[PDB]
C-alpha cells in the first residue's frame, strides 16, 4: 500500500533456542593391542 | 631453606623434594599440578551467522515508472522493471499494457538463529598462566592453591609460601586467529572485519550480537518477474555460514599436541603438558624439628625383592634399618632413576620395611635418603608384558 | 581508477596527487587524513588506591584474659592487651587491676575515595588502528569518514571507495606495562599482582572496583593503649598510593616521542606521526568526463616572481595559457619539488593566470601539469626572516 507502513511488531511464535537432542551412540570398539601398536577394530551401524 | 627447583609442566606426577636446612631434620615436600589452565588474551573481532533476506513488499504502479531511493539498509538492493502485468487472483488490475511497472527491493537480516547459533573471532595475546598446586609437605598433608604463573606473584597460602614461574616455553596452542563455534574453536584465518566475500566464510559479519549495523557482501541480484507474477524473485550466492559448516576442519580440540583440553571458558588451554616450571619455595619455620631429636638410622641396608621395567609401580624393595630411637621418617632418591611411592615410614628399633617403586632402568642404581643416611639399592630390573594402561606413574625415562 | 599510491603519515599535510585514467580527463584528487588514532588493545590487572584503616569497636573484659581469632579480613591484625585499668567519663571501667584485657583489632578496607579517584594498570596487546579521513576529488565534494588501517577493510561515503593502510611502521609508543590515573597514562612497571612492598606503589590491590576480595600488604600493627585510655591506636606505614601521586615522573603524554596524545578513551596515541601509509583509492566512473571535452592548453610557458625558501606557501609564479576552450583545468606537480597552494584553475583564451606554492630548495626546478600538459618553473629563492612560526607544510627536504 502507497500510504504509509503501518506499526504493529509481531512477535515470532517459534524462536529457535539451545535445547538437548537425543543423540545416536556408535557400538563399543573392540581393542586389541599389540607392541607400541594399537589396533582397533570397529563396526558401526551408521557412518561414524 | 628456599628449596628453589625446576619441575617438568606434568599433571600426575609428585614433586618429592626434600628441604635439607642444617640444623634441622630435613622434610619432604610434594607438588602437583591439578590445572594448567593458560587463558591467553582475547578481542572479539565480530560475528558469523546464516542470513535472512528480508524482502519487504514490493509496490506496483499501475501506469506510470517509480524512481527508487538508496536506502540505508546493509546491501540494499533496489530494481524497478517495465513491461509488467500482474494477475492476482481477480485477473488483471492494471488497465494499462505498457506503463506498468514494480519496484522491488531486498536486503539482508541476521537470523533469528544468530542469538543461539553463531562463530565467534578473536585475536589472541600472549596472556598469563594459571595453574591449581596441591601441596602435601611435612603434616599439613593437604593445601589446595590457585595460582599465576608470574615469577612475581607470591602464593602465601596457609602458612607455607609460594613463588611458582614464569614458565619456561611460551608453547601457546592458539594461533593469531581462532574461530569458537558454541563449543569447538578452530584455528581458521578469518580476513578481516568489512571484508568478506560472498559465499565463502563470513558473508555477513556482525560486530556484536546486539550490534544494530553490520556488513554484508552477499552479491544479492534481483530479477524480472514472470508471465506477471506479483513476488520478488532474488537470486543470490548460498549463505557463506552454511558452507564451511559442513566443511570446517578438524577442530583445535583434537588438533593441538601435547594433550591440550579447551572449553567454553576465556578459552584457557588446559593441562598442556609442556617444558619446566622454575618453582621456588619458603616452606615455614615451625613446621622444622631440631636435627639431634629425630633418631639416627645409620648401619642400613637395602636390597630389592622384584623390580619391573614398566611404567606402573612395578618395583618391590625392602630395607634393613638399624635405627635408635622410633618414629616416622620421610624417606627420597635424589636420582631421577626411581620414584618411590612411599612418603613416610614408622621406624621401630632396628626395623626391616618394605617400600614401592618404579623405575624406567633396567638396573636402577640409585642413592637412597632416608634422615641423613645414604643407600644404594643396586639390582636388576624384569621387563613387563602387557600394553595398556593409563600413562606413566613414574614417566622419568633416560638412557639405559 | 584503481589509483595505488603511498603516503607520508602526517596528520596536517594533504596529498593531492592527479589520477590520469586513459581515455578520460584527469581527475584532481586529495586526501588528508585528521586523525591517526592507535587504539591499542587493553586488560587490567588491577586497581590501586589508598587504603582506609577501618578500626572495629575494642572489646573490653573486666576480670579475665580472652584470646583472639583469625577472622577472614584482608590483613586482620589482631592483639590483646594486658594490665589496662580503663578510664571512660563515668569512673574506672572494671574493678580488675590485672585481669582486665583489651582485645583491640584492626583490617584494612579500600578507602571510600577509590570509586573515583584510582590508578589503573594494564597489559597491552597489538590493538588496531584507525582514522578519520577527509577527501575531495574532481569538483564533487567535501566528504569524510572514520576507516580502519588493515588493508582489508573498505570505507565509504558518498560513491568514492577506499583502502589505506597498514602502517609501515609497528611503532606503539606505549610500553608494555602502562599505568591510567584520570586522564594521564605513566608506562610505570607495576610489580605483579598480590607482591605490593609496603609504600611503595600498589600497597592495596583490588581485582576490580567491586571485587570483595584484595590484597593489602602495609604493615598494619597494633600498638598498646596509652594510659588507660578506651582507643586503638595503631602502627601503620604511610599509604603507598599518597607515595608516587606527589612524585609520579612525566606522564607519557609527555614524553611520546613523534608528538603524540592520549585520552579518557579507548586509550588512543592519536597523531602518532611515523613511517608511511599506503593508500589506495577507486573513484567512481561517474566523475570521470571524456578527454575530447575538456580544454587542451598549449604554447604555454612559466615564471616565477617571488619565491621564499620557506616552510608556507611564500612561492608566487605566473603562468600564460592558449587553451582551446573556456572552462576548469585541474593543476599538479608531479615531483616532490614543490606543493601547489591552489587546487584548480579556470581558464579563458589567451589569458594569464597565477597561483601560489612552496619549496625546500634554492633553485625549483619542477613541472607543472596544467590539465594534461607540461612546462617547467625554474628560478631562485630567498630564506625568510621569521625563523619559527608555524609546523611546516613544504616537506621536500632533501639535497640542495
Given at each position: 500500500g502507497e500510504g504509509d507502513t503501518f506499526k504493529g511488531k509481531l512477535h515470532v511464535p517459534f524462536v529457535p533456542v539451545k535445547a538437548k537432542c537425543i543423540a545416536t551412540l556408535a557400538p563399543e570398539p573392540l581393542v586389541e593391542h599389540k607392541h607400541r601398536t594399537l589396533i582397533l577394530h570397529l563396526h558401526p551401524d551408521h557412518p561414524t | 631453606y628456599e628449596h628453589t627447583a625446576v619441575m617438568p609442566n606434568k599433571v600426575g606426577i609428585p614433586y618429592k623434594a626434600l628441604v635439607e636446612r642444617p640444623g634441622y631434620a630435613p622434610v619432604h615436600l610434594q607438588i602437583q599440578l591439578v590445572n594448567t589452565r593458560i587463558i591467553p588474551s582475547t578481542n572479539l573481532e565480530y560475528i558469523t551467522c546464516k542470513y535472512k533476506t528480508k524482502v519487504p513488499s514490493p509496490v506496483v504502479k499501475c501506469c506510470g515508472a517509480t524512481q527508487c531511493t538508496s536506502k540505508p539498509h546493509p546491501d540494499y538492493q533496489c530494481q524497478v522493471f517495465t513491461g509488467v502485468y500482474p494477475f492476482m487472483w481477480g485477473g488483471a488490475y492494471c488497465f494499462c499494457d505498457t506503463e506498468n511497472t514494480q519496484m522491488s527491493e531486498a536486503y539482508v537480516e541476521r537470523s533469528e538463529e544468530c542469538s543461539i547459533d553463531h562463530a565467534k573471532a578473536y585475536k589472541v595475546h600472549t596472556g598469563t598462566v594459571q595453574a591449581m598446586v596441591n601441596i602435601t609437605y611435612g603434616s599439613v598433608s593437604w593445601r589446595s592453591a590457585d595460582v599465576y604463573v608470574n615469577g612475581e606473584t607470591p602464593a602465601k597460602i596457609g602458612d607455607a609460601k609460594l613463588i611458582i614461574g614464569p614458565l619456561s616455553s611460551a608453547w601457546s596452542?592458539?594461533?593469531?586467529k581462532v574461530v569458537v563455534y558454541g563449543h569447538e574453536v578452530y584455528n581458521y584465518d578469518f580476513p578481516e572485519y568489512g571484508t568478506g566475500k560472498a559465499g565463502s566464510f563470513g558473508d555477513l559479519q556482525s560486530r556484536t550480537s546486539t550490534s544494530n549495523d553490520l556488513y554484508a557482501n552477499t552479491n544479492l541480484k534481483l530479477q524480472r518477474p514472470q508471465a506477471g507474477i506479483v513476488h520478488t524473485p532474488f537470486t543470490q550466492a548460498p549463505s557463506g555460514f552454511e558452507r564451511?559448516?559442513?566443511?570446517?576442519?578438524?577442530?583445535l580440540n583434537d588438533v593441538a599436541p601435547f594433550g591440550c583440553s579447551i572449553a567454553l571458558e576465556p578459552l584457557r588451554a588446559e593441562n598442556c603438558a609442556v617444558g619446566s616450571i622454575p618453582i621456588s619455595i619458603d616452606i615455614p619455620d615451625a613446621a622444622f624439628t631440631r636435627i639431634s631429636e629425630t633418631p639416627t638410622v645409620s648401619d642400613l641396608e637395602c636390597k630389592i625383592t622384584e623390580c619391573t621395567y614398566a611404567s606402573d609401580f612395578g618395583g618391590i624393595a625392602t630395607v634393613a634399618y638399624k635405627s635408635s630411637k622410633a618414629g616416622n621418617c620421610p624417606i627420597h632418591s635424589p636420582s631421577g632413576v626411581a620414584v618411590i611411592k612411599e612418603n613416610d615410614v614408622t621406624l621401630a628399633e632396628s626395623g626391616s620395611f618394605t617400600f614401592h617403586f618404579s623405575t624406567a632402568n633396567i638396573h636402577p642404581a640409585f642413592k637412597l635418603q632416608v634422615c641423613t643416611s645414604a643407600v644404594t639399592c643396586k639390582g636388576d630390573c624384569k621387563p613387563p608384558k602387557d600394553h595398556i594402561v593409563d600413562y606413566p606413574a613414574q614417566h622419568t625415562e633416560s638412557f639405559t
Open positions: - | 596452542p592458539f594461533d593469531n564451511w559448516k559442513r566443511d570446517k576442519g578438524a577442530p
